[PDB]
Subunit: 254 residues, 6 copies
């Protein structure tokens, strides 16, 4: 990506247009990450945010977000599993909403395709796939490079190429990560399953905490504070705002 | 392999067909692993599951599984040893069951052949061998690559190529591994010899524990929970269900 | 860069010209660093210092500094965020001061441009951009090389190239670094958000410490001591002196 | 090496031919190791075992073994030391036995020859020398490769090449190793000088333990258990059975 | 460099000429090192010893040293800083002594030049610069190579090249090093700022210890023991003998 | 080096000639090492053994050793230092002995010559220099290679080349080492300065233990036991048998 010098006098003289956020606290045209241990629900959450930006409803009740074409690249899930996940989500959408989602969302399975962003063929293809789009989701980062995720140099190159695509096309990029990488990212969100401790704190008996997960923004530079959110895992894993009440007075001794 | 974009509206519109499992909790067309310390019985278990999927009887009493051509690639055992294991297993099969196994199972010894999936010759050969088959078993992974199993980058490439073959041919791949690879695998099963503590728990005298092993699925993303299984080692190591009874009231002080 | 041998006799007889400092304690024509944890305010401080040297006012109350052309290279901030930062700073500048800054400061966004000082094309371009200039700011170092920052050999080459550019052109270079690498630098400054301990030491009640940050020179070889400074964070993050006084007697028990 | 698929039906119907052991518990046509600290007596034991298989007497009292041509490759001992070792062993052989050994054993000194199994010239030469032979002994492994023995990738290739030679020619390969690397071997034997604790356990007074060494198979997959053996060190280092008996009641307090 | 065989009979027959020392305990035509933490005063001490060997006075009161052409190569200090140090030193030299120093000392700044002794261009240039000279000072070693100072192999090559230049030209080489290299060096001297404990030992008030430094030889193979020296820091850092008296009876309790 | 197969029948039928030792317990035609911390006296001891094998007297009173041409390669000492060392030693030799030493000993200084045995030019030269000789001494190993002495692979190559030279030419090679390497060597000797503890044990008062050093063979496979020897350091470092008496009854409390 190449940029023209900033017009300093203009920036001083007039108020610049408000920042454009693709996601809460994430500026459009940049790279971000969604992290959590495997199985926490990143793929489901990612699909839901993708569907919302594509034009679907705000089922997650995060802020209302601008709409634009979205491309989701799942490289770890078998296609038939994705079918089932979409069918499950579909139960939460009206006929008009299902249509809007299909009109703005592209899902291209890449399991076994071996994408390597450090290879010209894939960098070129990914950049072309980002053109005209507002968001690109990579699930997960591990399958889009062949470097050591512990090597700062190689990873600075891998992440740098995502920044190049985003800056040149305007299409934001969010990669999922099972868990440095975070040091090279300016926006980071996460998923954290409800712990036994949190279960007691929110009046959820153990045995049931398996159905709740919290989401928040762990790293951001701009925008108003985004409060952590609790989601309930419905049939098929679909996430929806949880209805929970703080257990001010303990039920026993935590 | 290459995939067609997901038809979103169709996925929403009607429930997709049920998932096709090659093994308990493992989706057909993906890669999985069977792990345990050396000498625990992976080769015998693998041969039995292979014989089952090939069309043989469900001697292991694990779930009922779809049948299809199977290719077993033992790269560490002397060919004559494989003959002894087959002969032992044969004593548990009727005439028609032996014919069934023979018609659907191919066993190609590779000791001394040095297969290297990162080499074009072997990748192409292994992919060709997977064509038209339901399952391919690699025994063990160590002899199918020349990388440092501690290196995430190189191993991501090795496992990645197995995913390419499985997704492209539809043939599932399961590799054995002597006790990371777990991080890059979505399905994982294991074998663990009966401990002295477990022997006490199941009323099995110590010294006799050497004849029992437990089999379970430690990592799976889809499907109903698979209950751990206890197997009894018979002549030649052939595995059978074993009917153990948990000692409710201990025989003494464990 | 090339230097002429030192004329010994002349150095003895003539009074050495006063050292030319681009920044407090930093000799013009050398490389230096501004260090701090991400989010402490390096980008804002650097911008204000750059505006001052370019010809703007001494808003920070640091020593008056020689003026000269300045080029600021932000490689991590999206252009729109820079527009906003400039507009905020502009509220502290008169019409004449705004023009002075615009006349002497050049800001070239590099997000996604992937600069690599070890690559001929980039070394040449950066060297070319340093010609005729007083100061060049790299924000941050991590985005100007693809090496391991903990590797002395590689970083010697990276830092060495910045030294070559500064020496040959006369343009000083200051790179930002998010909290080894300081062992290769002769000038280092830092930013440190006020801690609870420091707030009690300076008469700032807790809950208000979020408004203050300290700036100081942690490594220098020449010049009179630069006293640590406390800055108050104003709208948009603009830093202003806001003088504090030491709390001789504690307000309680620290 | 190349193998023919296993004829399943035949393996079921026909009784598998008895496993052919080159050494106790070691299947002919595979790779194995003899391990111990330097100086324990590996070279002498290996020479005696080699002489036996070549057609000499069973001086060691191990199981009678099939006879066949043997090639011994000492890469660490100067030729003159080998002459002396042979002369010492000769005192235990009759005229007819000496001739049998000379007829079936080939000893090619390689000290200073710098064999490297990873080099085409040496892999080809060693493979050629294994043709038509029953056993090939490498003394010791360290002098047949230039890799890091603690590096799994490189050693996989080194050991893999020995497996290829053994499988293709039918000639078993046993390499000596001075006390990871055993994880890649299926057969392992050892030598261990009698310790003070073992001497008291076997009725040997201290000060005499220097005369005894124990031999045993530490890793094996097939065959009836081989009982650990105690050998007495005679002139020149020649090993002979010398049977000991367990000391039921201690001679004091161990 | 190339050497003629030693004439043994001649060496036996008569006592060889006395050893030629370039510095205390350091034989002419070899490599040595001056080590200390950064900021201890190595550059000033080095310049003074250089000025002495060049023909200046023995201000340091170290042994009397043979005179000869000297070349000083400071690669980290801005040229203008060197002018200030020379000017300060000049105040301690008479008119004739200044001329003496100027006639025998060459100072070639190399900041930003990036000398790399492993590169043919620089090795050849440095060797040419050593021709006809008595001493060459490298300040500091870090800027004369691009290797990992932790790597024994590469450093053995770097130091080796310095030995080649010294042995071939006869010009001794001393490199400064900010606190392995010691293992590959036969002569090593150091600087260590006065500790609070040492201050007490020499009746120097704390807070004033900052003006004293001790110089010594930590590694030397030949010559009479060199006694540690205490130096007083004067204006501009110029070093002078300092006449300290050891406090026999302590002033209080150390 | 290449060797003809061993004539087995001949080795059995007749007693082979006694082993030829170049040094106590070291077989001629092999590689050995002399190790000790720097400054212990390896260079002096090495020169003395070299002079003895060359034809000089057994000043060290080790065993009487066969004579043959010797070449000593000092790569760390300045030539003039070697002159002084030889002159010192000369004081202990008669005119006839000095002549014998000069007739059989060649000393070729290599300081700054940068020998690299892994380079064709140097391997070829060293091998040529070993032809017709009985012993070659390298002082020290570090200066004859550019590898990491901690890397077993590279070192196996470096040492292997010395074995190649020795085996092909018959010239033994002993390298000195300041202190793995020892694991690759079959003969090792050492020097150990007298400790305060040893001083008391041999009735040597402290302050004087600096004049005594012990020598022994730490690793050997053949020959009769070699008892550790105590040497006294005379003028110039020349070593001679020390006249010491065990302090059976302590002088106080050790």
């Amino acid at each position: 990506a190449t940029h023209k010098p900033i017009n300093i006098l203009e920036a001083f003289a007039a108020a610049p247009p408000p920042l454009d956020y693709v996601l809460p606290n994430m500026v459009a045209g940049t790279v971000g990450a969604l992290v959590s241990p495997g199985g926490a629900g990143k793929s489901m959450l990612a699909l839901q945010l993708a569907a919302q930006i594509a034009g679907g409803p705000d089922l997650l009740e995060v802020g209302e977000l601008p709409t634009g074409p979205v491309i989701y690249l799942p490289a770890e899930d078998p296609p038939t599993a994705i079918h089932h996940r979409l069918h499950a989500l579909g139960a939460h959408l009206s006929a008009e909403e299902r249509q809007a989602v299909a009109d703005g969302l592209l899902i291209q399975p890449l399991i076994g395709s071996l994408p390597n962003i450090m290879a010209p063929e894939w960098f070129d293809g990914l950049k072309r796939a980002a053109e005209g789009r507002r968001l690109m989701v990579l699930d997960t980062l591990r399958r889009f490079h062949i470097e050591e995720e512990n090597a700062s140099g190689p990873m600075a190159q891998v992440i740098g190429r995502m920044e190049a695509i985003a800056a040149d096309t305007g299409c934001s990029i969010v990669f999922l990560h099972h868990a440095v990488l975070v040091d090279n990212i300016r926006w980071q969100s996460y998923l954290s399953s409800m712990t036994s401790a949190e279960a007691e704190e929110w009046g959820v008996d153990d045995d049931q905490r398996r159905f709740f997960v919290r989401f928040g923004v762990s790293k951001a530079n701009y925008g108003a504070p985004f409060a952590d959110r609790w989601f309930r895992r419905h049939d098929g894993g679909v996430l929806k705002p949880a209805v929970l009440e703080r257990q001010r007075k303990s039920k026993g001794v935590p």
